[PDB]
Scaffold this active site. Structure first.
Site, PDB file in Angstrom:
ATOM      1  N   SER A 101      37.559  39.113  41.524  1.00  0.00           N
ATOM      2  CA  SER A 101      38.619  38.218  41.093  1.00  0.00           C
ATOM      3  C   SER A 101      39.027  38.276  39.634  1.00  0.00           C
ATOM      4  CB  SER A 101      38.351  36.762  41.501  1.00  0.00           C
ATOM      5  OG  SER A 101      39.620  36.220  41.882  1.00  0.00           O
TER       6      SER A 101
ATOM      7  N   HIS B 277      47.011  35.227  50.045  1.00  0.00           N
ATOM      8  CA  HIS B 277      47.906  35.882  50.982  1.00  0.00           C
ATOM      9  C   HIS B 277      49.063  36.639  50.363  1.00  0.00           C
ATOM     10  CE1 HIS B 277      45.438  34.261  53.969  1.00  0.00           C
ATOM     11  NE2 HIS B 277      46.311  34.341  54.957  1.00  0.00           N
TER      12      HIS B 277
ATOM     13  N   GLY C 187      32.036  38.506  44.278  1.00  0.00           N
ATOM     14  CA  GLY C 187      33.414  38.053  44.194  1.00  0.00           C
ATOM     15  C   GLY C 187      34.002  37.888  42.813  1.00  0.00           C
TER      16      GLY C 187
ATOM     17  N   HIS D 191      37.479  30.399  55.624  1.00  0.00           N
ATOM     18  CA  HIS D 191      37.861  29.457  56.655  1.00  0.00           C
ATOM     19  C   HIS D 191      37.013  28.203  56.793  1.00  0.00           C
ATOM     20  CE1 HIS D 191      39.975  33.186  57.458  1.00  0.00           C
ATOM     21  NE2 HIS D 191      40.960  32.386  57.827  1.00  0.00           N
TER      22      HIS D 191
ATOM     23  N   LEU E  62      35.242  39.198  52.066  1.00  0.00           N
ATOM     24  CA  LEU E  62      34.653  38.120  51.283  1.00  0.00           C
ATOM     25  C   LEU E  62      35.520  36.869  51.107  1.00  0.00           C
ATOM     26  CD1 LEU E  62      33.337  38.761  47.648  1.00  0.00           C
ATOM     27  CD2 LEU E  62      34.887  36.946  48.246  1.00  0.00           C
ATOM     28  N   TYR E  63      36.837  37.041  51.050  1.00  0.00           N
ATOM     29  CA  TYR E  63      37.716  35.903  50.838  1.00  0.00           C
ATOM     30  C   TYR E  63      38.086  35.115  52.072  1.00  0.00           C
ATOM     31  CZ  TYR E  63      39.815  34.183  46.482  1.00  0.00           C
ATOM     32  OH  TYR E  63      40.042  33.503  45.304  1.00  0.00           O
TER      33      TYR E  63
ATOM     34  N   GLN F 186      44.363  29.812  50.001  1.00  0.00           N
ATOM     35  CA  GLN F 186      44.978  30.519  51.114  1.00  0.00           C
ATOM     36  C   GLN F 186      46.324  31.102  50.689  1.00  0.00           C
ATOM     37  OE1 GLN F 186      46.345  29.530  55.754  1.00  0.00           O
ATOM     38  NE2 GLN F 186      45.161  28.059  54.522  1.00  0.00           N
TER      39      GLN F 186
HETATM   40  C1  HEM Z   1      44.157  25.912  59.389  1.00  0.00           C
HETATM   41  C2  HEM Z   1      43.753  27.000  58.505  1.00  0.00           C
HETATM   42  C3  HEM Z   1      43.760  28.386  58.706  1.00  0.00           C
HETATM   43  C4  HEM Z   1      44.149  29.127  59.799  1.00  0.00           C
HETATM   44  C5  HEM Z   1      44.691  28.667  61.158  1.00  0.00           C
HETATM   45  C6  HEM Z   1      43.948  30.546  59.442  1.00  0.00           C
HETATM   46  C7  HEM Z   1      44.228  31.615  60.305  1.00  0.00           C
HETATM   47  C8  HEM Z   1      44.099  32.968  59.994  1.00  0.00           C
HETATM   48  C9  HEM Z   1      44.420  34.049  60.900  1.00  0.00           C
HETATM   49  C10 HEM Z   1      44.926  33.885  62.309  1.00  0.00           C
HETATM   50  C11 HEM Z   1      44.215  35.204  60.297  1.00  0.00           C
HETATM   51  C12 HEM Z   1      44.463  36.561  60.934  1.00  0.00           C
HETATM   52  C13 HEM Z   1      43.299  37.330  61.571  1.00  0.00           C
HETATM   53  C14 HEM Z   1      43.465  37.622  63.078  1.00  0.00           C
HETATM   54  O1  HEM Z   1      44.552  38.115  63.510  1.00  0.00           O
HETATM   55  O2  HEM Z   1      42.501  37.358  63.838  1.00  0.00           O
HETATM   56  C15 HEM Z   1      43.739  34.810  58.961  1.00  0.00           C
HETATM   57  C16 HEM Z   1      43.413  35.691  57.986  1.00  0.00           C
HETATM   58  C17 HEM Z   1      42.947  35.343  56.723  1.00  0.00           C
HETATM   59  N1  HEM Z   1      42.719  34.060  56.282  1.00  0.00           N
HETATM   60 FE1  HEM Z   1      42.912  32.405  57.272  1.00  0.00          FE
HETATM   61  N2  HEM Z   1      43.444  30.701  58.167  1.00  0.00           N
HETATM   62  C18 HEM Z   1      43.315  29.395  57.696  1.00  0.00           C
HETATM   63  C19 HEM Z   1      42.822  29.077  56.434  1.00  0.00           C
HETATM   64  C20 HEM Z   1      42.421  30.008  55.475  1.00  0.00           C
HETATM   65  C21 HEM Z   1      41.866  29.648  54.142  1.00  0.00           C
HETATM   66  C22 HEM Z   1      41.632  28.230  53.587  1.00  0.00           C
HETATM   67  C23 HEM Z   1      41.590  30.814  53.479  1.00  0.00           C
HETATM   68  C24 HEM Z   1      41.041  30.917  52.183  1.00  0.00           C
HETATM   69  C25 HEM Z   1      41.667  31.480  51.001  1.00  0.00           C
HETATM   70  C26 HEM Z   1      41.990  31.882  54.421  1.00  0.00           C
HETATM   71  C27 HEM Z   1      41.893  33.230  54.119  1.00  0.00           C
HETATM   72  C28 HEM Z   1      42.260  34.245  54.966  1.00  0.00           C
HETATM   73  C29 HEM Z   1      42.196  35.630  54.574  1.00  0.00           C
HETATM   74  C30 HEM Z   1      41.748  36.191  53.230  1.00  0.00           C
HETATM   75  C31 HEM Z   1      42.633  36.312  55.667  1.00  0.00           C
HETATM   76  C32 HEM Z   1      42.787  37.818  55.802  1.00  0.00           C
HETATM   77  C33 HEM Z   1      44.279  38.178  55.687  1.00  0.00           C
HETATM   78  C34 HEM Z   1      44.625  39.649  55.826  1.00  0.00           C
HETATM   79  O3  HEM Z   1      43.729  40.506  56.026  1.00  0.00           O
HETATM   80  O4  HEM Z   1      45.824  39.953  55.739  1.00  0.00           O
HETATM   81  N3  HEM Z   1      42.491  31.391  55.640  1.00  0.00           N
HETATM   82  N4  HEM Z   1      43.672  33.437  58.795  1.00  0.00           N
HETATM   83  C1  LIG Z   2      31.977  33.382  35.976  1.00  0.00           C
HETATM   84  C2  LIG Z   2      32.749  33.955  37.127  1.00  0.00           C
HETATM   85  O1  LIG Z   2      33.056  35.098  37.278  1.00  0.00           O
HETATM   86  O2  LIG Z   2      33.080  32.935  38.057  1.00  0.00           O
HETATM   87  N1  LIG Z   2      33.812  33.427  39.193  1.00  0.00           N
HETATM   88  C3  LIG Z   2      33.582  32.772  40.358  1.00  0.00           C
HETATM   89  O3  LIG Z   2      32.785  31.806  40.403  1.00  0.00           O
HETATM   90  C4  LIG Z   2      34.287  33.238  41.605  1.00  0.00           C
HETATM   91  C5  LIG Z   2      35.711  33.275  41.743  1.00  0.00           C
HETATM   92  C6  LIG Z   2      36.287  33.733  42.972  1.00  0.00           C
HETATM   93  C7  LIG Z   2      35.487  34.149  44.045  1.00  0.00           C
HETATM   94  C8  LIG Z   2      34.099  34.119  43.927  1.00  0.00           C
HETATM   95  C9  LIG Z   2      33.500  33.665  42.713  1.00  0.00           C
HETATM   96  O4  LIG Z   2      32.125  33.658  42.660  1.00  0.00           O
END
Ligand code: HEM
Ligand SMILES: CC(=O)ONC(=O)c1ccccc1O
Ligand SMILES: *[C@@H]1O[C@H](CO)[C@@H](O[C@@H]2O[C@H](CO)[C@@H](O)[C@H](O)[C@H]2NC(C)=O)[C@H](O)[C@H]1NC(C)=O
Ligand SMILES: *[C@@H]1O[C@H](CO)[C@@H](O)[C@H](O)[C@H]1NC(C)=O
Ligand SMILES: *[C@@H]1O[C@H](CO)[C@@H](O)[C@H](O)[C@H]1NC(C)=O
Length: 551
Positions: free
Chosen positions: A498, A175, A494, A356, A352-353, A171
């Site tokens: 990445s 971000h 992905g 949650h 893709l990322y 996360q």
């Molecule tokens: C308690 C945990 C978490 C909460 C409360 C949370 C909450 C949020 C919220 C509120 C948004 C904004 C979208 C909207 O306005 O509806 C968001 C976006 C996002 N979250 Fe989570 N999140 C959590 C955990 C995670 C985790 C573990 C990942 C994994 C890497 C993650 C990845 C993302 C991504 C990639 C976005 C899109 C951000 C963007 O477009 O700027 N989040 N999250």
């Molecule tokens: C060999 C190789 O590229 O591994 N990458 C991954 O597993 C990987 C990393 C980040 C997001 C998705 C993925 O699938």
């Protein structure tokens, strides 16, 4: 009707409208020819017939422990890593192609970086259906689709034993480059730099950086609490943070990423890296006494970028892949290859990322178990327990499985819902079409998609045709490997995103990958030998159990 709605051009060929109703595919360099780029060239045919399935490769990579152990200790390790590094990247286009404004190459697309790029043009606004040619006139109700297929009923732990330490890292890390502009709409990003610039630690704009900086010894501002070091307060670092009204500046921590205050887990990693940055400064100063603030700072930032990129490849990705092959970070592996040292975040990569599902039902910190309403905005837990304390706790609690379906906590299910809604505003193409983009056979049925018959059955009545199945839902509901954290598509799509975004950094280039760049051998090794453990323990009084894998 718009002929490109039928997505006629195969193998990366480009669909261009001509005359009033014609269309032509530009099969330049696609390796195929003909009207729709389907007639392979001699070498192309060979390559495509001599390539073991994605699943087979995966097999080989996850078995033969005794074998790999031997390979990992030879040069074949490097050889394969390079293969991986290159092969995987050639899928992502660079210079980048399109964006939410242009479904064709344009100088602006290439210049205006407030734009997220995309790998596949949008579904033409004038197609018979929302997905192009197939499906019903109206797509499934976003929310329903979410309650029916993504809402966690019973907590399903990630079989690979991934912990919250990993989750929060993912996360925190993402971000720094995933920052959608609320003021500009979808497809726009306040995270210029599109990559690992560590903007989440230093800020996405100078003024903010300057505010976060101490301007002494190259260090970054901070504050002491309970004898420990924590990011400064907003009163001392008058930066803009996103906290709920009612919380005084003296209670807010300024860090670099506005949102990071909304979770101890985030602010945790924020502290760890700040800690590190300051420490590296010290190191650099002992070495370069004649250096000033800027250069100490500037250098220390390059070292952390290096470290970050290292820890991600060898420990983080390693963790995910579950590969028996020992992934390796070595910018040199590409010096012989043809590679562009630049990256541009793709909207599809953003979708893709959204992992949650990793988030737990509740957060355990020793004998105490905290709820969302206790975790989400707790402005003291971090300072209360301490860095070590939390790292130990997060490293011990398992994260949830990502792929599989029905495994997103209700507290945050509202997100997956908007992700789907946004997907439509962005007019993302059909799941299968993306499957092909990343070299995979499109699914023929929902039952081939999901590993079962019941859920598929319902998805079918809803979507109408597998070819209407959307990008995000496809990634999250697709059947999972034996017992992996997610599916084929997640990996195959992905990984390119990445690896490219990791190696496509100027410090990975031959011009930058020099010791002088990091202030000499001391700084250089810091990068060359960075590890999740060191990142933590060399910045904490005691050393807790630290790892992306639960013990
Ligand atoms: C308690 C945990 C978490 C909460 C409360 C949370 C909450 C949020 C919220 C509120 C948004 C904004 C979208 C909207 O306005 O509806 C968001 C976006 C996002 N979250 Fe989570 N999140 C959590 C955990 C995670 C985790 C573990 C990942 C994994 C890497 C993650 C990845 C993302 C991504 C990639 C976005 C899109 C951000 C963007 O477009 O700027 N989040 N999250
Ligand atoms: C060999 C190789 O590229 O591994 N990458 C991954 O597993 C990987 C990393 C980040 C997001 C998705 C993925 O699938
Ligand atoms: C990048 O592109 C966006 C959108 O194309 C530009 O923002 C628009 O700018 C025009 C004229 O300045 C305004 O009429 C719109 O209101 C803006 N829309 C948005 C989304 O903000 C933006 O200026 C471009 N960025 C740069 C510096 O080139
Ligand atoms: C090219 O694609 C179009 C649309 O799918 C189709 O009508 C046509 O038959 C295809 N031509 C060939 C030779 O595949
Ligand atoms: C915050 O967490 C502490 C322990 O870290 C707990 O005692 C307190 O009740 C929590 N406050 C909130 C947000 O309810």
């Amino acid at each position: 009707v718009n002929p490109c709605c039928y997505y006629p051009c195969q193998h990366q060929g480009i669909c261009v409208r001509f005359g009033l109703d014609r269309y032509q595919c530009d099969c330049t360099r696609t390796g195929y020819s003909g009207p729709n780029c389907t007639i392979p060239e001699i070498w192309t045919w060979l390559r495509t017939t001599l390539r073991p399935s994605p699943s087979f490769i995966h097999f080989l990579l996850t078995h033969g422990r005794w074998l790999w152990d031997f390979v990992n200790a030879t040069f074949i390790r490097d050889t394969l890593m390079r293969l991986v590094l290159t092969v995987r990247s050639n899928l992502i286009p660079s210079p980048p192609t399109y964006n939410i404004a242009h479904d064709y190459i344009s100088w602006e697309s290439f210049s205006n970086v407030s734009y997220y790029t995309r790998i596949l043009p949008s579904v033409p606004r004038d197609c018979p259906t929302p997905m192009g040619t197939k499906g019903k006139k109206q797509l499934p109700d976003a929310e329903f689709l979410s309650r029916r297929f993504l809402l966690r009923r019973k907590f399903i732990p990630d079989p690979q034993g991934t912990n919250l330490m990993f989750a929060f890292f993912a996360q925190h890390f993402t971000h720094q480059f995933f920052k959608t502009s609320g003021k500009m709409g979808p497809g726009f990003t306040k995270a210029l730099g599109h990559g690992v610039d560590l903007g989440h630690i230093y800020g996405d704009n100078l003024e903010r950086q300057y505010q976060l900086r101490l301007f002494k010894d190259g260090k970054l501002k901070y504050q002491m609490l309970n004898g420990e070091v924590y990011p400064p307060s907003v009163e001392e670092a008058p930066v803009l943070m996103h906290y709920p009204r009612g919380i005084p500046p003296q209670s807010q921590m300024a860090v670099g990423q506005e949102v990071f205050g909304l979770l101890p887990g985030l602010m945790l990693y924020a502290t760890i890296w700040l800690r590190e940055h300051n420490r590296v400064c010290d190191l650099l100063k002992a070495e370069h006494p004649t250096w000033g603030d800027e250069q100490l700072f500037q250098t220390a930032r390059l070292i952390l970028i290096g470290e970050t990129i290292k820890i991600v490849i060898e420990e983080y990705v390693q963790q995910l892949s579950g590969y028996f092959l020992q992934l390796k970070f070595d910018p040199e592996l590409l010096f012989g290859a043809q590679f562009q040292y630049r990256n541009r975040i793709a909207m599809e990569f953003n979708q893709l990322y959204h992992w949650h599902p990793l988030m737990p039902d509740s957060f355990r910190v020793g004998p105490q178990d905290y709820s969302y309403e206790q975790f989400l905005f707790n402005t003291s837990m971090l300072v209360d327990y301490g860095v070590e304390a939390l790292v130990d706790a997060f490293s011990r609690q398992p994260a949830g499985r990502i792929g599989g379906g029905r495994n997103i906590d209700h507290h945050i299910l509202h997100v997956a819902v908007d992700v789907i809604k946004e997907s439509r505003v962005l007019r993302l193409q059909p799941f299968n079409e993306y499957r092909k983009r990343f070299g995979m056979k499109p699914y023929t049925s929902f039952q081939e998609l999901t590993g079962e018959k019941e859920m598929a059955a319902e998805l079918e009545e809803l979507y109408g045709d597998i070819d209407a199945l959307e990008f995000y839902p496809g990634l999250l509901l697709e059947k999972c490997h034996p017992n992996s954290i997610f599916g084929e598509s997640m990996i195959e799509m992905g990984a390119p995103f990445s690896l490219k975004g990791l190696l496509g950094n100027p410090i990975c280039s031959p011009e930058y990958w020099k010791a002088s760049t990091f202030g000499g051998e001391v700084g250089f090794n810091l990068v060359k030998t960075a590890t999740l453990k060191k990142l933590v323990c060399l910045n904490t009084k005691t050393c807790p159990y630290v790892s992306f894998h639960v013990p």
